[PDB]
Amino acid sequence: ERIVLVDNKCKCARITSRIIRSSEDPNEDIVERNIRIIVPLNNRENISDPTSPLRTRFVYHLSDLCKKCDPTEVELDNQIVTATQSNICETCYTYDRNKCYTAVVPLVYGGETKMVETALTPDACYPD
Amino acid sequence: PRLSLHRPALEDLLLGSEANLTCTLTGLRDASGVTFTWTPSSGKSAVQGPPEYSVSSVLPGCAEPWNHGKTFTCTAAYPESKTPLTATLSKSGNTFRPEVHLLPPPSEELALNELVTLTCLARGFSPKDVLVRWLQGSQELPREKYLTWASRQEPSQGTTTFAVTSILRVAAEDWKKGDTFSCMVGHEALPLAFTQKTIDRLAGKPTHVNVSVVMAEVDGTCY
Amino acid sequence: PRLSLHRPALEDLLLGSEANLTCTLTGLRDTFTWTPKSAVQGPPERDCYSVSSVLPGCAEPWNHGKTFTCTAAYPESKTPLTATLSKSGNTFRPEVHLLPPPSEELALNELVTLTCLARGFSPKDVLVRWLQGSQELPREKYLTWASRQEPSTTTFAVTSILRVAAEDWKKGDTFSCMVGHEALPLAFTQKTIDRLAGKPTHVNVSVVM
Amino acid sequence: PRLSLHRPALEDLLLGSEANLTCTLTGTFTWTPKSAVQGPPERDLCGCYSVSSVLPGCAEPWNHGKTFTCTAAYPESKTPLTATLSKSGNTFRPEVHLLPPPSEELALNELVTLTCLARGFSPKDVLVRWLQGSQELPREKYLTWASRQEPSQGTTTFAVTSILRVAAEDWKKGDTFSCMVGHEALPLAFTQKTIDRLAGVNVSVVMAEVDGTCY
Amino acid sequence: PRLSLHRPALEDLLLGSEANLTCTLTGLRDASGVTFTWGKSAVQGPPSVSSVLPGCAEPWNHGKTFTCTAAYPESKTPLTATLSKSGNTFRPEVHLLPPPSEELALNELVTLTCLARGFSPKDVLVRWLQGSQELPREKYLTWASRQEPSQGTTTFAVTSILRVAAEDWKKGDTFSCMVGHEALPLAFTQKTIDRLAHVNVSVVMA
Amino acid sequence: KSPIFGPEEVNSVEGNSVSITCYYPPTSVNRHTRKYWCRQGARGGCITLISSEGYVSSKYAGRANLTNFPENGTFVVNIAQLSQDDSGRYKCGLGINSRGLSFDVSLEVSQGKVYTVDLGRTVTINCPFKTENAQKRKSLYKQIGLYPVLVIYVNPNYTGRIRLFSVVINQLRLSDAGQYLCQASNKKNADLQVLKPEPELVYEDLRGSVTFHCALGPEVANVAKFLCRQSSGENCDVVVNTLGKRAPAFEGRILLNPQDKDGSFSVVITGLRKEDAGRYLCGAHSDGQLQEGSPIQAWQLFVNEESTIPRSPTVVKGVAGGSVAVLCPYNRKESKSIKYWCLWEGAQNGRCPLLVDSEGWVKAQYEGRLSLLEEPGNGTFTVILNQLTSRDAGFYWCLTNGDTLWRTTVEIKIIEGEPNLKVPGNVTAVLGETLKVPCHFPCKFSSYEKYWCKWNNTGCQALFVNCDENSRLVSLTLNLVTRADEGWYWCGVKQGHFYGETAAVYVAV
């Protein structure tokens, strides 16, 4: 009954909304704005680099959660035009479940120093 | 007698890809023996047919020479003074893109319960030319249903940027029900040449917020 | 040769105590008669000359809708030119909505944009002023669009924009839009916003550990 | 007079390029898929000179699952001796756990001891490497135990531990140490875990503009 | 024909009774012919041969050197092996490390670790107790005594892991690692952990 | 919603085995992440009982295994030797036990002449009797609340269905699930158990298609079958019918296939929406509605919102005389198939007749104006239809020949307007002397590539062709016009791989 406005996975915020429209009395309606921040509390600052300090300040601007970095198609009077619905289009507070985060480290192996590539989130990082 | 060379209109360069360059010649007393010549005319033919005074001449074309940027010159000659006038145009560099903002109704109008006013402000763009279309749902409204002002220059002592507003008055039960209204702003400095903001009653100014902060240590995946 | 009768200016009729009328011509190549204090003639002002006849002190006769009529007789021909003007009474007062900044603009924290919108007034003439708290801002600080006509009776609209600093908005200074239209009995309608206005939202923070 | 087929070592399989199999007889050689080399006698205890044969370039044949058979002929018994070997297919992933110093070792300011437990992986070959921030520590600064077999909770799984002793002025000044475990069953051949002084509480969640337009 | 005298094992030295030095001689051929000169049990039991001196638990903790001479007719002179109790001894430093938090998130079993560090003789005995009941040795895994890297003195280390049910941890009972060694006077250092060994957020909304 | 789906309620008797299948979106994270079977007990907290990373509990040791098929996109839990301690609430899921991504299963086992039949079939109750009862009232009795009432003279409740020894009862209502006694001075007891149908789990995608295989018996094949959908309460929304009904929502995307030799039809639904999920009930009652005593059969649909089916134009518009180029997507890995294109002609009829296919068959009335292309490959094909009319407006289906079919429907609308390419009418060449055909095109297409193709059944391929770019004009010039150079030619625009508007002209010699 509550539609979903945002489902951000870089900062893990999930704004939903629902008009509870009182048919009894005419202009006392209740729009709701449930927000569901999850604070990772164990993650680094540069999350793709495990040498950074712990993240201790989490700043959530709603204009930067809600943004749409995806183009759209609009029918303008005969045509289909493509549009850029953004105006602002970063640091990430959580990893994404469906995304592969690696980090290159310098292991030695004998007479060389090979830049091998580890996997910070395994099971999202398998090749197919 | 002077000579001006105007730019392609934005409605036609953007939705239609026509870059018809107009060359007007104003300051004529009697003569209909004007003559135009276009130096990057690789075949296309100008027109004539002067009203009352001025003489116009439109060189046709498509947007691919104009968007690539080319120097079009309208060398005009008349039988009043034997030197010819010249004029040159190209696509203007130093462009900024608009910052489209779509503003909800004021609460005065929603409590009056009759018709509410959605405002579209586009701001900070460098050429004077912009297109503001409006949509309801996804059906484009007819242009006699909204007011759109001109593109004036906003005050700053630095760069020269412009701004335009647009007003759509919709039904109060139509807003209060909850369908979406879009303002689409097209400008030649935008990457895909069009931006499109969309607002309804859910996507602006609630009357109850419930923030729910979930602290958890073993996190950092966002399932 | 054409003739024109220009209405009183709105700022000199709202603020000041002098709303002079003006009868001007456009195309003579060579006096005046006001059928309703005499006139003050102007420069020759060639272009097709344009001499003027201003007329002072006729503000309150103009407010009562008495039909002014100018008649200029130039010796370029015989039939003198005539132009009439009255004050129309079909006036509606404005609805003046002052509108807050976008949420996107005060998260970037550089300059915010306040939008005044005067809507629905029937004669075209309007005046828009801004005030920060109580001090008027100069005319070069804001931008006022023209008084366009609405899609509908026949009503008009005009929007205005002011960009103030975000540190000037966030510490709580009010801003007012003053729309002055000739239908208002007080001659002005003022609307005000600051950072906390508009029946505020109930926030209900709850931390789950 | 026995014969064994030895798998390629894990560090050559993950770090390097070529993965060479070994066939050792204790008491000529034929291989089922590139020419191989024999070996010296290499005389072990009480005799039993051992010729061995190493076959190179077998990285993708081994990693696909081709079953290797080595057969050696020798003039004691008339029949050749065979040996077979394949990559195992069960292959569970290691769980890497980096454990902070005990709370009674910080209050002496000499050296603190970080522990690294890899647990629950099904082939018993694993690599443990230690990192100081991003510079790798040598092999002579830490101690890694063998990969032993856990008590049963279902399938057959294994476990390994490693230890690291760092100076307590490093642990208090706030740099990080990583344990890096490499296994066959892992996605990109290595996985990492990192710890510092803080993860072994004051956060400041600020929510600006909770009302206003979300679009 | 190689002779080695193996010490009494620590298990029989701290808990058992038959503290017995084992004198082993490998690599003989013909049939037999060995004499073992040290309450003596003249037992040989040859598969190589291994003679057992039992009953000498008390002279071992004195500190005198045990001299075993094994005589065999393959060569001429008998062989000799000497051994006594270690003198330069250090005591363990038991640390019973808590489970990691990902283990608690998966909700299956939790993993207690017991690290006994820095002791100078190699032989050590790890035992585990839940409450006061000793767990059987098929319930934990114990690695060996590996010498740890130091340019100071030769010190050894041992880890031992115990996986126990997360219902036991969340219910709340205690788990004890009991490390035994010969350089401890009370013979067993026992450490104990239970579940019970602030977040302070600031919501700075607008 | 979590996209995991399995049985909402499993049932078994004591001592037997249970197999529980849970479905997940087969992305590359879900296939390699950790699967669990936790028991949601009281007090809070799942307690993981078996996992896919090796852990089997102590209660479940030796009598369960969790096996995982990443190719199907599912995982199944086998539990042997149940007992009434296994009754409770459980969850099957992926990853960490507390983060969601789970389905709550509710497994309730129970204690171990009993007839067990299905809804709407028949029962023959064979009851013995004695030699000294060959005259009296042979009868059944029912016990409606510890009260012996006559049933069979027939009971008013059982009117028309029962018949007399043994008795036979047809079209069993669910409220005949009591216990009866056969009395000829003697009495026998007989317990009826009428089974609800267990819903088969259909786990489909968004914008994909479901085929309900509706196989009842051959005894009921001459009855008017139907497909209801159970709402939040009890009434069904009759979706299709074999009497002519169809829901207004399923217009252009339903299909009721004709029956078989044994009455086994199938109902195809395409373009699945978030609101199409729920319980669906095939049945066979003579009014086409759901009544008491109709042999139903149930599916439980889960429309997965985490779909990888590419989002497409669901409505194409084209002007009368113009053209339409549809992109139909298919599964990328089955790139060699035979691709089709279809139409729509009603529900009870259920007709989707073929227009064009990928092997070179085009229909009779669509010659010169339909083509199926292969570009752009790797999961899309283009279908170009021109020479449009107002009666080309309808719903068209993008069938293939593989096993993973998403029969993508698309609606063509015919709006008012004029086409973009301006070709002549139907030019008439002559023998030997040449022909010149032009094709003017607007300023929108001056970036695009232009062509003239000659149309065959196997797909038209380009040709000589001049392209005057100053005066916008694509000329066609046939040098020596033979009788072979006949048929339909097409001018059209094209941007690399994606095709655009076309227009057609016929050259008669």
Q: How many residues does chain E have?
A: 206
10 Å CB burial of residue F299 (0-12, 13-18, 19+) is: buried
**Any CB–CB contact under 8 A between E139 and chain F?**
no
End-to-end CA distance of chain A: 39
What sign does the CA torsion over B196, B198, B203, B205 have? positive
Q: Residue D143: what residue type?
A: L
Residue C203: CB atoms within 10 A of its CB come to 17
F44-62 b/e (C-beta count within 10 Å ≥ 16 → b)? ebbbbbbbbbbbbbeebee
Question: How far apart, in Å, are the Cα atoms of A23 and each of A3, A30, A33, E97, E143?
Answer: 20, 11, 20, 62, 73
Pairwise CA distance, residues F440 & F492, whole Å: 10
Q: How many residues does chain D have?
A: 215
End-to-end CA distance of chain B: 72
Q: Are residues B74 and B170 in the same domain?
A: no
Q: Are residues B67 and B150 in the same domain?
A: no
- Between chains, do E201 and B217 touch, taking CB under 8 Å as contact? no
Backbone angles phi, psi at E58, to 5 degrees: -65, -45
Q: Which of F53, F56, F58, F59 to mutate to test the interface with D (most CBs of D within 10 A)?
A: F53
Angle among Cα E179, E184, E189 to the nearest 5 degrees reads: 35
Pairwise CA distance, residues C166 & C110, whole Å: 6
Q: Is C60 helix (H, G, I), strand (E, B) or coil?
A: helix
**Any CB–CB contact under 8 A between C106 and chain D?**
yes
- Between chains, do D113 and E111 touch, taking CB under 8 Å as contact? no
Q: Are residues B99 and B132 in the same domain?
A: yes
List of chain D residues whose C-beta atoms are within 8 Å of the C-beta of residue E201:
203-205
**Any CB–CB contact under 8 A between C203 and chain D?**
yes
User: Secondary structure of B73-135 in the HEC alphabet?
Assistant: EEEEECCCCCCCECCEECCCCCCCCCEEEEECCCHHHHHHCCEEEEEEEEEEECCCCCEEEEE
* Sequence-distant (≥ 6) Cβ neighbours of residue F264 within 8 angstroms: F213, F214, F215, F216
Q: Is A12 helix (H, G, I), strand (E, B) or coil?
A: coil
Pairing of strands F188-195, F148-150: unpaired
What's the gap in Å between the CA of B12 and the closest CA on chain A?
13
**Any CB–CB contact under 8 A between D206 and chain C?**
no
Q: Are residues D109 and D187 in the same domain?
A: yes
Q: Tokens 């996605």: give the residue.
A: D187
Helix segments in chain D, DSSP class H: 10-14, 60-64, 168-173
Q: Is D140 helix (H, G, I), strand (E, B) or coil?
A: helix
List of chain A residues whose C-beta atoms are within 8 Å of the C-beta of residue B201:
19, 31
Helix, strand and coil content of chain B, in percent to the nearest 5, comes to 10, 40, 50
Q: Tell me, what DSSP letter sits at residue F199? A: P
CB B38 within 8 A of CB B74: yes
Helix (H) or strand (E) holding E166: helix E166-171
Q: Residue E117: what residue type?
A: R
* Sequence-distant (≥ 6) Cβ neighbours of residue F54 within 8 angstroms: D92, D120, D122, D153, D154, D155, D157
Q: At CB < 8 Å, which residues of chain A contact C? A: 33, 61-64, 87-88
- Between chains, do D213 and C103 touch, taking CB under 8 Å as contact? yes
Max CA pair span of chain C = 96
Last residue of a domain, one of B60, B90, B120: B90
Question: How far apart, in Å, are the Cα atoms of C62 and each of C3, C33, C53, F24?
Answer: 20, 17, 17, 81
Pairwise CA distance, residues F5 & B212, whole Å: 28
Technique that determined the structure? cryo-EM
Nearest residue to C157 (alpha-carbon basis) of B124, B199, B119: B119
**Any CB–CB contact under 8 A between C208 and chain E?**
no
Q: Are residues B77 and B39 in the same domain?
A: yes
Q: Is D208 helix (H, G, I), strand (E, B) or coil?
A: strand
Nearest residue to F400 (alpha-carbon basis) of F324, F341, F350, F332: F341
E105-137 b/e (C-beta count within 10 Å ≥ 16 → b)? bbbbbbbbbbbbbbbbbebbbbbbbeeeeeeee
Backbone angles phi, psi at F175, to 5 degrees: -85, 20
**Any CB–CB contact under 8 A between C205 and chain E?**
yes
Residues 60 to 99 of F: which have CB under 8 A from any E CB?
A: 96-98
For residue F214, the Cα-to-chain-centroid distance in whole angstroms is 11
Question: How far apart, in Å, are the Cα atoms of D129 and each of D134, D184, D191, F22?
Answer: 12, 15, 10, 39
Nearest residue to A63 (alpha-carbon basis) of A8, A19, A2, A9: A8
Q: Are residues B35 and B101 in the same domain?
A: no
Pairwise CA distance, residues C193 & D59, whole Å: 72
CB B221 within 8 A of CB A41: no
What is the full DSSP assignment across E129-165?
EETTEEPPTTSEEE---EEPP-SSS--EEEEEEEEEE
Pairing of strands F297-304, F200-205: parallel
Q: Do the chains F and E touch each other, judged by at least 3 C-beta pairs below 8 angstroms?
A: yes
List of chain B residues whose C-beta atoms are within 8 Å of the C-beta of residue C147:
none
CB F306 within 8 A of CB F3: yes
What's the gap in Å between the CA of A80 and the closest CA on chain B?
10
CB B209 within 8 A of CB A26: no
Q: Residue E181: what residue type?
A: H
**Any CB–CB contact under 8 A between C196 and chain E?**
no
- Between chains, do F54 and D154 touch, taking CB under 8 Å as contact? yes
List of chain D residues whose C-beta atoms are within 8 Å of the C-beta of residue A63:
209, 212-214
Nearest residue to B163 (alpha-carbon basis) of E16, F84, C115, A60: C115
- E73: number of CA atoms within 13 Å, CB side? 4
Pairwise CA distance, residues B76 & B23, whole Å: 9
Q: Is E168 helix (H, G, I), strand (E, B) or coil?
A: helix
CB E68 within 8 A of CB E5: yes
Q: Are residues E176 and E75 in the same domain?
A: no
Pairwise CA distance, residues B197 & A67, whole Å: 11
Last residue of a domain, one of B90, B119, B142: B90
Q: Are residues E73 and E117 in the same domain?
A: no
Pairwise CA distance, residues F125 & F123, whole Å: 6
- Between chains, do A39 and B215 touch, taking CB under 8 Å as contact? yes
Q: Are residues B35 and B2 in the same domain?
A: yes
**Any CB–CB contact under 8 A between B82 and chain C?**
no
CB B36 within 8 A of CB B49: no
Question: How far apart, in Å, are the Cα atoms of C154 and each of B172, C38, C92, F52?
Answer: 21, 36, 10, 74
Q: Tokens 């217009």: give the residue.
A: F251
Pairwise CA distance, residues F89 & F139, whole Å: 45
F255-293 b/e (C-beta count within 10 Å ≥ 16 → b)? bbbebeeebebbbbbbbbeeebbeebbbbbbeebbbeee
Nearest residue to F289 (alpha-carbon basis) of F231, F245, F255: F245
List of chain F residues whose C-beta atoms are within 8 Å of the C-beta of residue A78:
417
Q: Tokens 């021909």: give the residue.
A: C77
What sign does the CA torsion over A83, F274, F354, F345 have? negative
List of chain D residues whose C-beta atoms are within 8 Å of the C-beta of residue E141:
148-151, 159
Q: Do the chains B and D touch each other, judged by at least 3 C-beta pairs below 8 angstroms?
A: yes
- Between chains, do F99 and B221 touch, taking CB under 8 Å as contact? yes
Nearest residue to D185 (alpha-carbon basis) of A123, A92, E102, F421: A123
Nearest residue to A76 (alpha-carbon basis) of F346, B150, B143: B143
Pairwise CA distance, residues D53 & D39, whole Å: 6
Question: How far apart, in Å, are the Cα atoms of B207 and each of B115, B203, C200, D210?
Answer: 20, 12, 7, 11
CATH of the domain at E7: 2.60.40.10
Pairwise CA distance, residues F120 & F166, whole Å: 19
**Any CB–CB contact under 8 A between B62 and chain F?**
yes
Nearest residue to D27 (alpha-carbon basis) of D16, D37, D14, D41: D41
Pairing of strands A30-35, B208-215: parallel
What's the gap in Å between the CA of B38 and the closest CA on chain C?
34
What is the full DSSP assignment across E67-82?
EEEEE-SSSSSPEEEE
**Any CB–CB contact under 8 A between F232 and chain A?**
no
Q: Are residues C16 and C114 in the same domain?
A: no
Pairwise CA distance, residues B127 & B151, whole Å: 9
List of chain E residues whose C-beta atoms are within 8 Å of the C-beta of residue F48:
106-108
Domains of chain B: total = 2
Q: Are residues B114 and B71 in the same domain?
A: no
Quote the domain boundaries for residue D103: 87-215
Q: Are residues D109 and D208 in the same domain?
A: yes
Q: Which of A78, A82, A96 to mutate to test the interface with F (most CBs of F within 10 A)?
A: A78
Q: Is B138 helix (H, G, I), strand (E, B) or coil?
A: coil
**Any CB–CB contact under 8 A between D199 and chain B?**
no
- Between chains, do D210 and B205 touch, taking CB under 8 Å as contact? no
**Any CB–CB contact under 8 A between F332 and chain A?**
no
Q: Which of E107, E110, E163, E167 to mutate to test the interface with F (most CBs of F within 10 A)?
A: E107
Long-range own/partner contacts, residues E138-144 (CB < 8 A, 24 or more apart): E138/D151, E139/D151, E140/D151, E141/D148, E141/D149, E141/D150, E141/D151, E141/D159, E143/D145, E143/D146, E143/D148, E143/D161, E144/D145, E144/D146
Question: How far apart, in Å, are the Cα atoms of A45 and each of A61, B220, E199, F15?
Answer: 17, 12, 19, 54
From start to end of F358-407, where are the E strands?
A: 370-372, 380-386, 394-398
CB B152 within 8 A of CB C143: yes
CB E56 within 8 A of CB E19: yes
Q: Do the chains C and F touch each other, judged by at least 3 C-beta pairs below 8 angstroms?
A: no
User: Which chains pack against E, by 3+ Cβ pairs within 8 A?
Assistant: B, C, D, F
Q: Residue D119: what residue type?
A: R
Pairwise CA distance, residues E67 & E49, whole Å: 17
Residues 27 to 46 of B: which have CB under 8 A from any C CB?
A: none
Pairwise CA distance, residues C82 & C23, whole Å: 10
Ramachandran class of C85: left when φ > 0, alpha when ψ lies in -120 to 50, beta otherwise: beta
Q: Tokens 């996109």: give the residue.
A: F73
* Sequence-distant (≥ 6) Cβ neighbours of residue C156 within 8 angstroms: C120, C121, C122, C123, C124, C126, C147, C148, C149, C150
* Sequence-distant (≥ 6) Cβ neighbours of residue F215 within 8 angstroms: F262, F263, F264, F297
**Cis, peptide link before residue F376, omega less than 30° from 0:** yes
Q: Which of A6, A61, A62, A64 to mutate to test the interface with C (most CBs of C within 10 A)?
A: A61
Max CA pair span of chain E = 96
- Between chains, do A105 and D174 touch, taking CB under 8 Å as contact? no
Pairwise CA distance, residues F504 & F323, whole Å: 9
Pairwise CA distance, residues A107 & D131, whole Å: 9
Last residue of a domain, one of B46, B68, B90: B90
A101-115 b/e (C-beta count within 10 Å ≥ 16 → b)? bbbebebeeeeeeee
Token pair recorded at residue B140: 């484009």
- F111: number of CA atoms within 13 Å, CB side? 0
Question: How far apart, in Å, are the Cα atoms of F158 and each of D76, F121, F170?
Answer: 92, 14, 10
End-to-end CA distance of chain E: 86
Pairwise CA distance, residues F500 & F474, whole Å: 15
Q: What are the structural domain ranges in chain F?
A: 1-112, 113-196, 197-304, 305-416, 417-509
Pairwise CA distance, residues A41 & A54, whole Å: 8
- Between chains, do F53 and D92 touch, taking CB under 8 Å as contact? yes
What's the gap in Å between the CA of D109 and the closest CA on chain B?
29
Q: Tokens 């924009």: give the residue.
A: C161
Question: How far apart, in Å, are the Cα atoms of D35 and each of D9, D71, D73, F466?
Answer: 20, 15, 17, 62
Pairwise CA distance, residues E157 & F439, whole Å: 88
